[PDB]
Design a protein around this ligand. Structure first.
Ligand SMILES: COc1cc(C(C)=O)ccc1N
Length: 116
């Protein structure tokens, strides 16, 4: 069972996260946590039980919170699935989510092969 050093796991996975952040405009609604109070959407946490966003993923990747690569992958998919569950299919958020998911799959596949 391969053990992962925290800084090596971060270096391996960081380019996949940077690829998401580089999408403009598609990363913009994902760069900060959904704040239902600021946005006036009190139903949000009734639907999204486990919020996730790029800034939280980055913080976790920077602070040794992912012991194995699949935990990072799970958080990326959680972010996407939250947005695809809460938002209209033709909404900006949903369409932007789909672009990020396209980019992510391209980026994570060879990385996971090299890790393993
Ligand atoms: C309230 O609409 C939003 C929903 C979302 C997500 C990610 O679901 C993000 C930013 C918004 N402004």
């Amino acid at each position: 069972k391969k053990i992962f050093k925290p800084e090596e796991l971060r270096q391996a996975l960081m380019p996949t996260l940077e690829a998401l952040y580089r999408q403009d405009p598609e990363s913009l609604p994902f760069r900060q946590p959904v704040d239902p109070q600021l946005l006036g959407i009190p139903d949000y946490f009734d639907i999204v039980k486990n919020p996730m966003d790029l800034s939280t993923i980055k913080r976790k990747l920077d602070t040794g919170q992912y012991q194995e690569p699949w935990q990072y992958v799970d958080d990326v998919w959680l972010m996407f699935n939250n947005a695809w569950l809460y938002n209209r299919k033709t909404s900006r958020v949903y369409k932007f989510c789909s672009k990020l998911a396209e980019v992510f799959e391209q980026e994570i596949d060879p990385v996971m092969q090299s890790l393993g």
